[PDB]
């Protein structure tokens, strides 16, 4: 079979700078930042379709589709998390078993796009937002 | 009354402000190459070039995809997809001709080649997306309404003495208790609460989604044929928390009708039931008629924001097949029941236990496909650790098939000081251990981070150890996101294998102002054009710099939204001043919008003008036709000018004066020059 | 009404230009923005030049003000220096109001003996009759907020680096002192207690 | 069958409050001067109330911002009386506008700042003031429009 492309194993995404005006109330979202997961040596015969599932810590039980930012020495932002969308534009549940939309595996290089976004659960205090997530790939 | 008034949603953008784009070509290339050296088979070279062409003329967007593969022994250009997309504003929909896919959720995902017209939700404002209760009320007297969540307020406004409907409430997660509190100037406050729970099939009140797809069926498998088909999908959000959703899938041999209802029961949760009735002719001449019922339940937040449960059941009677089973070859066991049970429980503000259980039984074959997954992710300070367990017992004698995983991420900022200037601050240590519950061990410990000024150069060096075999696999990767493309190089060492990966990705736009290169594109792109401003980095994006002509292309821009494009004035040549360093563009899906900037290239000057030994008054305009520059006198006759020649003259219009000036070469080399020049 | 990007602009030493965003949320409003920089004594100064000093903003728009340095390395490199950045929005019978927004411009030397994190805790309190003098040895301007001496707030204080600010304390207050300083980004550090050293 | 990790890094920065003063163009309307009423120094006019809103910002940053009024004083004795700013045939004599507090105490125009004590109205934070004409000896039938400056120290 195939595997995740080299260098896409551990990835970093710079969401940038967002303001409380953009994230002032529950449900407010920032501008999505795109990032792709690359797969190599995936033949059509061995695996026709594939999808990924992101595993992460939810900020609260009510919002299980958004992540939780880690505390920092300088200070961590409050009432805000990171949300991972899909190609269709829908949020992804961070459960280990909830996979994303299927894609057709072209022979050779295959890139799957995603968008990281900010999701504020109430008023967002200023700070630094750093979040982590683990993704697993299934082949069909 | 607010109900009769045409109040617009929060964050609403008129359709007239939407930018169709520019008439320009497009070409995204992705070349990858792997040199694999093994002691048994010498060395080999693999190459794959993925080329996505495209053309945006008017509003139509033509896109084509091609692949070229090379081994070291022949060249094979292979088309994949070609589609002409467009957006229709009056219908609030998107049309697509040619290849594509069916985004159907009521039916199964289908790849096709034909014409699809489907309603798009991204064109709606972000406020009225997803599911959120609409509040209908009648206020006696002029009142102020504060619809507030269990945590904080959401919607605060003023309502006249009459009926009022509020539909601007955000999604606010899966479950929510919205307390509507109206306060009249005269009467006492009136409060009432409404709880809600959401399911993806639910829609807002008076919200309609439709999809009409027609044409041939395309699949990767060669065995499956290519029959023509039609597919209609409808999703309507009825009043009082109901949803009516149906569909129809028709072909030569397969005729299916889907009907279903969903409900928001409030404190209890959310429900969705649908039935699909299908008459399908199998690959053989035999005909089979069947029904399949899908049940879905979503419990609300049990305890106090601790547990959420999802139960998805599906019963498919003997004689129900999907469209693939019909479209198999001329000559080529159904699912009796599928149960999915998901329980999420948050504890200690740190750990999030996720439990998932799937249980699928077939017809005749009494063997069951049980699948259990238990994940536990915790984030203690900067440390982020995760322990996962999986257990799969399927019909085809998979046995126990257990797995255990442990992943730990430790940032180096946990030890480095807050204001450290060392490059080690942008680094982390990742450690992963995997047991197969059989003695199969997989360790992988490594470092990763970014080590460039703009954090473009991302490095990742990880060693590992796979033990039953005892193979210590090293792994090293360097990615570079520059202003002309993405270049990645990797070296994967094993016991007797050495792989060398190298790839370059990029995008090219042949717009009216020539050819511009940049990072690989992603649907909508913004072309920043600031001629005369070479090597000026744009803000909030990594490694996006203008080329030697001042043209650059942004990879991603949010569609149908107000997105800011700013040029970082700090990393800009001291000889150039931008009239406007921030621009706003609202692009359409797959559109190239120009964010034009004006840049003055001459020296930056600050002039003290005195008229009759009296400083010029506030608000006077000082312009200069020698280099087409303008400025406003601030105070004491101080004016700021950008883009000015060394020796020149300016004209002031307080309510007609001329002032001459000359500057030394040290002054032209200075960042900002200050001089005094008496005016006529 | 115009708005600034942040309530606190920190300019590190060794640079030349520091950028600050000015935005206009009102869609139908014409403004004239005039900006300048004053020293710690509220006196107009030429040590920092804001460009463009005066410009016209039409409708909903965002511009960037570039603060150019002119210190010539004449400022001390031991402790932070304080300046006040003023931005005035002229709305070009009725009295017209021109809004002046004042923010703290922190000239921060490149190398400092202490990171900003631990500057908040090291703030000892000198307690006596009708006085609660705050002593700050760390080289950072400390913004003490909600100074609760047991059951009553005194006022917001700005303690200079390596300096002792003075606050008048009513005698009815208790011995317990709780405070919280505003950090770099503008948020409030979680409430700490205060020693009597 | 297995993958790795993706990390997201970003900054959330506080934004200064947007200041709205009464109606558009930061303009507050006042009643016309009464020649008969505006006789003596103690003679006054209608106290028109207005308010300043600190919107598009958190309720914590607005409450900590000091507030002051400043401008040009007509006379040394009339410290709290704004000088009328009009150069036309509509210029009036011995008049001016006064900016008052919540209770009705005169506000110093020197620049001495005070706390905001913002009231958290359903929308945002609000601070109310009043403006009233203040006779200083005589009245002239002219539009005595003046100008004042609002100072907000973002602590």
Numbering used by the authors:
A (entry chain B): 20 to 159
B (entry chain D): 116 to 187, 194 to 453, 478 to 613, 617 to 803, 809 to 833
C (entry chain C): 1 to 92, 101 to 205
D (entry chain A): 5 to 159
From the paper:
The pilus consists of a flexible tip fibrillum, formed by the adhesin FimH and the subunits FimG and FimF. The pilus rod is a helical assembly of up to 3000 copies of the main subunit FimA, terminated by a single copy of the subunit FimI that anchors the rod to the assembly platform FimD in the outer membrane. The assembly platform FimD in the outer membrane of uropathogenic E. coli is the catalyst of type 1 pilus assembly.
Next, we analyzed the process of FimA subunit incorporation into the growing pilus rod. Using a local refinement approach, we obtained a 3D-reconstruction at 3.5 Å resolution, capturing the usher along with FimC and the last two incorporated subunits, FimAn and FimAn-1. On the periplasmic side of FimD, the FimAn-FimC complex is bound to the CTDs, while the preceding subunit, FimAn-1, occupies the pore of the usher. Specifically, subunit FimAn is positioned about 4.5 Å higher than FimF, FimC is moved upwards by roughly 8 Å, and CTD2 of FimD is shifted upwards by approximately 4 Å. This previously unknown FimD conformation appears to be specific to FimD-rod complexes, in which another notable change occurs in the orientation of the Nte of the FimAn-2 subunit emerging from the usher pore. While no major conformational changes between the pilin domains of FimAn-1 and FimAn-2 can be observed, the relative angle of the Nte to the succeeding FimA subunit changes dramatically. This adjustment appears to still be constrained by the upper rim of the usher, preventing FimA from adopting its final orientation found in the pilus rod.
